[model samples]
Target chain A: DDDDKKTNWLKRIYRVRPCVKCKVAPRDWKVKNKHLRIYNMCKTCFNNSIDIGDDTYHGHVDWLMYADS
Target chain B: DDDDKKTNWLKRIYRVRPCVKCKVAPRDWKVKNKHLRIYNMCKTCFNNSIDIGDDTYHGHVDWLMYADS
Candidate 1:
């Protein structure tokens, strides 16, 4: 099915940005850039990024990254 | 399927907000109030609310309300 093929392609692609500080790419990236730019790091980098800041929301940013656009 | 029943139930519920200013209920509310209170209005209410205010993003608030908790 075309939908199956599309799903397969989406799962197989690495269309996400590399973490600027960590220099690591997403192992798998499905969400689009227009969709994914809300944060500029992977889950690991984001965890680290949020920790060094004044914000006390380590768990909060995890939810914000749910931009499945 | 239980999943099908769950999907049907999700579609068959009205669990959303009434507009504060406009005071109208959603035609169908799926997303929970904990999930839906980001804007405190239905789509119609939100449109009107954003327009009357100084914020230029009538569309931005629409997306912010996608808290499907």
Candidate 2:
């Protein structure tokens, strides 16, 4: 079946993307722009980016490296 | 100082928002739309939303509840 084929393919490849910030493999994906597209950045980096003191604190994408493109 | 005041205020109140998914208090915030504005949704929920098998697996906002608004 198509589903089985896809599942098997994933199992074999286990595709993983690098985190934009730490350059680590298998980063978590998130929406990083106004376009609502996916980008690589781990949860650790995501959590660290939030600055409650900053009045402009909105989301990590605004400050994350290579996110604007 | 202004920073101290804000810090004090945060400490006193400890402002926490509810997760849009689980409605839990003090949930981790994330960008829930194209605007890139902050929204409440815990990391757990965020991780669960990713569907590798789906061809349209770009981001969670597209499928997340109340994300369109």
Candidate 3:
């Protein structure tokens, strides 16, 4: 089920950065260096992680995203 | 399952912009002629993703496969 965790992991990461409704970012991320990173999202946001797999979605991706490798 | 298909791949990716609920994203998604652009997320900073479904929740995001968290 590691792949299962991968399902919502990305979504979980988002909650850590910006709030969907308020557009807020993590102000208290766990920073290891001077890079200025936020810790993981609060516990409540963490719960959303499961929703990813619960979706029952499948296939070659139905949407497009903006990202770099 | 919306009648499932399966990327059966990794959980998620970075960047690519956020999306409305129910949208889908694929790996190697940077192609120039992708149709999913309308279906995936990766634009706004704070927004919904799943366009249709349970939309598992996050009290605080509550989650990268918890996105940005």
Docking class of 1: incorrect
Q: Rank the candidates by lDDT, best first.
A: 2, 1, 3
Q: Which candidate should be chosen as best, given DockQ against the real structure?
A: 3
In the range B1-69, model 1's lDDT, one tens digit per residue, is 223322332233223324444556653223443232123345776666567883432221111132121
Q: Rank the candidates by DockQ, best first.
A: 3, 1, 2
Q: Compared with the true structure, what per-residue lDDT tens digits does model 2 show for residues A1-69?
A: 223322332233224335556666444534444323223345666555563342232222112112221
Candidate 1 iRMSD in angstroms: 13.7
Model 3's chain B TM-score?
0.15
The alpha-carbon deviation from the true structure for residue B5 of candidate 2, after best TM-score superposition, in angstroms, is 2.7
Q: Give candidate 2 misplaced runs (Cα > 4 Å).
A: A1-69, B8-14, B29-39, B51-69
Model 2 deviation from the true structure expressed as Cα RMSD, one decimal place: 18.7
- Looking at candidate 1 chain A, the ten consecutive residues that score lowest on lDDT are A60-69
Question: For residues B1-69, could you state the per-residue lDDT of candidate 2 as single tens digits?
Answer: 223322332233224434556666444434444322222355665555453342232221111222222
Clashes of 2: 0
Chain B TM-scores per candidate, in order, are 0.35, 0.39, 0.15
Looking at model 1, residue B3 earns an lDDT score of 32
